[PDB]
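Notes continue from the previous slide.

Worked example: a multi-chain complex. Inputs as given:
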Amino acid sequence: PVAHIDQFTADMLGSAELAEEVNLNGSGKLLKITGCASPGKTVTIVVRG
Amino acid sequence: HRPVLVLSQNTKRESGRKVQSGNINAAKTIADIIRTCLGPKSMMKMLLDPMGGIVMTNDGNAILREIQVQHPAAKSMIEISRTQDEEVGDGTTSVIILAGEMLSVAEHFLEQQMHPTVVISAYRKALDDMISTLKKISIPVDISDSDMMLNIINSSITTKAISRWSSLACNIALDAVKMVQFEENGRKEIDIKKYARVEKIPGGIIEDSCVLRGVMINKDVTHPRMRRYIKNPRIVLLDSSLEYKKGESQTDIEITREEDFTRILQMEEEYIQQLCEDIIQLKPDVVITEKGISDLAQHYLMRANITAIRRVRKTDNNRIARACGARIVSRPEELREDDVGTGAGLLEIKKIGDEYFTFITDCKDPKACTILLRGASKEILSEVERNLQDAMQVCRNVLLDPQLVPGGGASEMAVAHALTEKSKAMTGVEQWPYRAVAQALEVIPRTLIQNCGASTIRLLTSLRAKHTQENCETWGVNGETGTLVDMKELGIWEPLAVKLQTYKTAVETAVLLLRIDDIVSGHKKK
Amino acid sequence: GPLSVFGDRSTGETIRSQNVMAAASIANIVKSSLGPVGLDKMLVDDIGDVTITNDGATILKLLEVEHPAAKVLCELADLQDKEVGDGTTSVVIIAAELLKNADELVKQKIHPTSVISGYRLACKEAVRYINENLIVNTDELGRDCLINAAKTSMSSKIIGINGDFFANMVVDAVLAIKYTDIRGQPRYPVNSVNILKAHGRSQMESMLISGYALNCVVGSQGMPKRIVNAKIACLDFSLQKTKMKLGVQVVITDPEKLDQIRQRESDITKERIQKILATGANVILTTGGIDDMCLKYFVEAGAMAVRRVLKRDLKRIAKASGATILSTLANLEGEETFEAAMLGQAEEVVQERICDDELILIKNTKARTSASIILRGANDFMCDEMERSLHDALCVVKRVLESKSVVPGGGAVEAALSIYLENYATSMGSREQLAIAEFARSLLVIPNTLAVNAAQDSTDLVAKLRAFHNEAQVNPERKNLKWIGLDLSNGKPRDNKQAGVFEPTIVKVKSLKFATEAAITILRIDDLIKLHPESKD
Amino acid sequence: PATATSVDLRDIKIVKKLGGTIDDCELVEGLVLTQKVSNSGITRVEKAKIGLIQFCLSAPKTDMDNQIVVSDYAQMDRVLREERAYILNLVKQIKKTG
Ligand SMILES: Nc1ncnc2c1ncn2[C@@H]1O[C@H](COP(=O)(O)OP(=O)(O)O)[C@@H](O)[C@H]1O
Ligand SMILES: Nc1ncnc2c1ncn2[C@@H]1O[C@H](COP(=O)(O)OP(=O)(O)O)[C@@H](O)[C@H]1O
Ligand SMILES: [Mg+2]
């Protein structure tokens, strides 16, 4: 989390192989980041219906 | 209190033959209201509005706009006459009677266990053949001829209440369209709603009403020292104010010294003198703006001999910009010589009934005019205003499409024999609803004889026999006398755009109301 | 003793019969608006607004319901518009007949979990059978597939003419907005087609404007209403007087500096209007606001200025004409540069007569050649029906051009699935064969509804319909009877391959997936508790 | 696993979206956001470097009450053009990061 613009360096950035907005056919659209260097212990489940 | 477990609370459901034959009786009811307002022997119908006024008219559009119905199929027929009033001028009433009759013959086939999609598919085949028949019986018009255009507009005002003053209303409505026929770029446009203003003044006689060569407004001069009679003025139109108002900011002045407060009140006077000096470099005569004029701005225009009008409307400024040839500027320091409306004729501040009216007339080549109507009261002046709107739009249709159809019943019977001879090659189940379209067109010569009191059996037999031969084919119903006179001798001619829009809207109204088999009423919206 | 809940509790087979009657309350409404013999309805509001429509989405959206099982079928029709774009009538009848036949199973002391497990073996096999028995893709038929699929969608609406007038205006509209994307994606955005309504001439005078038709006015009546070889300047910032922000105020200490600040509020405003106009721009579109002072600079220079346009309309013009949607000044600390090489182009920008209104048209836009459709009707009630019928027709050609696969319509799909699922339940059916057999009878309601609305023979025409589809599955001698449908104009089984009754594949694939999934949720309401409304406490 | 006997279920986000069937569920290990993209002219970038910014890219203002005094003709030009040069130094500081 970068608060001040003087500390916004390349070390505080992330990484993503693909960061696109998946244009869905249903209720609008969402974002989906695919792949990242050193992934944490988090995951996201997309539930349809 | 335990509520009852229901579904779709407080609504109604209706289906079957009660809706298919129910929309016919709602359409036949409106056709009986304006049935006595079609021919030249029609009568006025006095209406009462909740605003407190009185509408005494015989036009089919102005009658249905004052009727509030509760039936949903009856609300559709009111929007049909509103569509005919906005497309053409004198094409509304004829549609409501024709759509009521095409649905009258459609109710007969719904009792014969025929699907409504079969009758509509026969209506679309009959609609495509009525358009091709009117283009074969048409006649090209010379739009440059003055006396030929007077006979077209006289055929549209014989029905209305201005048929008594036919020699005056034809010359007013023809000259109003020919002045507003404006063409700047490569596109011809006729604007008879923004540039052809119809101003009515109660008083005088109707024979003194004439179309002015210019515009007029109900505004007096700003100062009595200013002139009320200029022979050749240089009219400069403004949009911004000539006053000192608060700017669109948070301006606040801190006054510390004694000379600062008197300087601000002098800079407010010098700012008005700066813009008043910028508008007199072109040496004008008449300054017309849309906003207020302060007394300090009237002081500089008084000694410069400038007549100033204060609070002219925005719609009146666009109309005088075409009549005098000016350009509406919104900046006094950005005035140019092309923004001055030269070529304006006599400007006179007359008074008509204890009220001043600014007359800007006698222009060289105006692109906008104002019809000055004068009558007995505001009741009948609204009738002539609504009739001149139906008299100027029927002249607009000839200038955009110079083709004439023989009206007075000759148009409806020439296609009724064309659909009858073309129905012999059908050989199917759609042949019988195709024949009912030709019988439904006969209600327009049926209404011309029911209004004048002529016979409906002895006349329809002789008129149908005249269209058997292909020689004359233009025999209609004379609504004045009541006999059969050829339309090449009477001079009753209707434009093509009126007759095409009448047939195209009457069929598609029957297309919409025949596909309705269910009605749900009782739901709310957001 | 009993439950002390302050609401209402109903268990057993009472709610199991109430949910079927709630689903049949919706299906029996829209059953009279299915197929080419379907008829429109009337939606009258409490204030008196009349909405004449026949599509299953507009009817169930405006109609208010109370039952919780009724809200499942009403939201099922809303999902068909987003996923497919038509089907909102056929999905509601299938999903309600799925509950009607499953109610007959659970009253025979059959467990509803076997009906849920039995429907999944029938739904996954129906998609598997329709993907192995498709007729042809869009290479052999060519452009005839797009016209025949468009006329199938319009047959249930007001634009179902026998000719190809409305069919050619839909195919040429989707084919003119072919926007290719990355990784080989020829997408067809049907939302970019501006569908306009105008109460004017008949339906045969509906204009197909190759370009864009903006629904706005010019404003000041001193500008040229027709500009040939125009340069469109698409921008989104209000051309008004320069007002300072909340943190900026004008505090003056000298009265001599008063008029220099008052004139600066218009000189900064007129500075932007002279550098975006001297570069050759003739048409200026603005989503903000152009006041009366800024309108003078366009009348003097002879330029067209359109104000207060929609933000969705500016993006469709700037993408089709090659213009750049600019909001402010930019390009690396420049005063006023405007990047004049990024102006749009147009062949002709002409404001035409649209029956007592003003409508601005752009001809072919010189970059992408977009399209817009101006509909013409008799009144406002027909034009609202023509807009919904045209939007359902644009979604058919979108799914066919994207997914090059069509199935024969008119009950040809439901007749082949009604006999295949009966033989599918015979082999691997021990305790779930009764649920697969009722899945075939529930699919037969789509050709059964076409016989009622056409006033034809009901139990004889559909019985003759499944006679051809039975011989195409038990006698493999290349009978080619898989495309047998209904001819409602004659009352006989027809061949939809030669007749041209084509529907997309996902209008039947997604219909069977949404109706089966909706039937599972309503099948599990064996216990229902309704609380009292907490309004007055 | 084989290092701890606890698991927090708040690290597993569940996004509920209407449309499709239950077979269309996904187990994407990245980040799924429901917000829209302004501006949406690109909506796709490969080899992306994502940065979380808690600073407000707008006009300069402080926690204390701040006002601008304008008492000159050219002072109005020094308000708008210096605000454009302020945020240009913020965007170019972001763009030079990569
Ligand atoms: N002198 C005449 N002789 C016979 N018919 C006439 C005569 N004058 C008018 N009519 C008929 O009266 C009808 C009046 O139609 P009208 O109600 O004015 O249509 P709209 O409502 O569209 O203006 C016309 O169709 C015309 O054929
Ligand atoms: N020419 C035709 N012959 C036979 N059946 C047709 C024809 N045209 C359309 N249909 C049928 O009419 C039905 C109309 O369904 P529709 O109400 O449009 O579904 P949705 O509500 O999902 O759009 C289709 O299922 C189709 O099978
Ligand atoms: Mg359809």
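Summary box: The two ends of chain A are 35 Å apart (CA to CA). The first strand of chain A starts at residue 16 and ends at 22.
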